[PDB]
Amino acid sequence: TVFRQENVDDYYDTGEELGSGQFAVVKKCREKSTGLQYAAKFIKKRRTKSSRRGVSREDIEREVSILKEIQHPNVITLHEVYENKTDVILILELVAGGELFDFLAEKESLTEEEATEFLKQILNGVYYLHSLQIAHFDLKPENIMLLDRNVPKPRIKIIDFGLAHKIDFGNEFKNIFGTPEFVAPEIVNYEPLGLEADMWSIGVITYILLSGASPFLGDTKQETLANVSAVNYEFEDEYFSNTSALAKDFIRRLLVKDPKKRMTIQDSLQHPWIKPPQFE
Numbered sequence: 001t002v003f004r005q006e007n008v009d010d011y012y013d014t015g016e017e018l019g020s021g022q023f024a025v026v027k028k029c030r031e032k033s034t035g036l037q038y039a040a041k042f043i044k045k046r047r048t049k050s051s052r053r054g055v056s057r058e059d060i061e062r063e064v065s066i067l068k069e070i071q072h073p074n075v076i077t078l079h080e081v082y083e084n085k086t087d088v089i090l091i092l093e094l095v096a097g098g099e100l101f102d103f104l105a106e107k108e109s110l111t112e113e114e115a116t117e118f119l120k121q122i123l124n125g126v127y128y129l130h131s132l133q134i135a136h137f138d139l140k141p142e143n144i145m146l147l148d149r150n151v152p153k154p155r156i157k158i159i160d161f162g163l164a165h166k167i168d169f170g171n172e173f174k175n176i177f178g179t180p181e182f183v184a185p186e187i188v189n190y191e192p193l194g195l196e197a198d199m200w201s202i203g204v205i206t207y208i209l210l211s212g213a214s215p216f217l218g219d220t221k222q223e224t225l226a227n228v229s230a231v232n233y234e235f236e237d238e239y240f241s242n243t244s245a246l247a248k249d250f251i252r253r254l255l256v257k258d259p260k261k262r263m264t265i266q267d268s269l270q271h272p273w274i275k276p277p278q279f280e
Helices: 057-069 100-107 112-131 196-211 221-229 245-252 265-270
Strands: 012-020 024-031 037-044 078-083 087-093 144-146 156-158
Touching: 012 037, 024 087, 057 078, 057 087, 100 144, 112 156, 112 196, 112 265, 196 245, 196 265
Parallel strands: none
Antiparallel strands: 012 024, 024 037, 037 087, 078 087, 144 156
């Protein structure tokens, strides 16, 4: 699929740079015709088929296709797509409250109420995605943005669908791999992947929200990955002594090696606690 090839600068003015990645940079922008604000994500294209630099056309189109399907309050929305010789530019909904990663870095740790307030939104967004057979595959605090961080109960949106895939045949088997600290054992072992991988990531996020510590983090990527594959984690008393048994139960049912025995997104919403790259 081809995208708009007019110069994006003729329709938008850019400003503050929100984030910078390995193959993408995001900048705040304003549409000239409406004055409405957005986030422009510039994704670097590959210059040759055998090039390691840039993102393949296939991978860019997958992200765009998935974003176009989604429409939910807890998921970033896509407005337009432009492209030129060097980049594909996604004009996305602007979320300027910062990363949940940054929010957590300031509060150190959250109360169960604060954690569940965030989790309920993440679960609702993932429920929507999984209902459409969409696996995100890169869930972590950095990919959860707040709309406004200056309110007692910040609302969020899931972002960065760069690894997202449609799981129409139950699983995907193509070496999909995210950040070591958050990937499920099946990812570490290069096995078929499904929606279950996202649930494991949610368990890791929940552990972090409640303790300010990462469950499988080692001193090197290989150590972290080895820890993940062996499900080498513990609810350290220093961090969890005053955490409810139900919260631990919730995490324990997500950090399960066998994907088939792991809680599904529907299970997570009915759980009593809720129910109202890889190489160094």
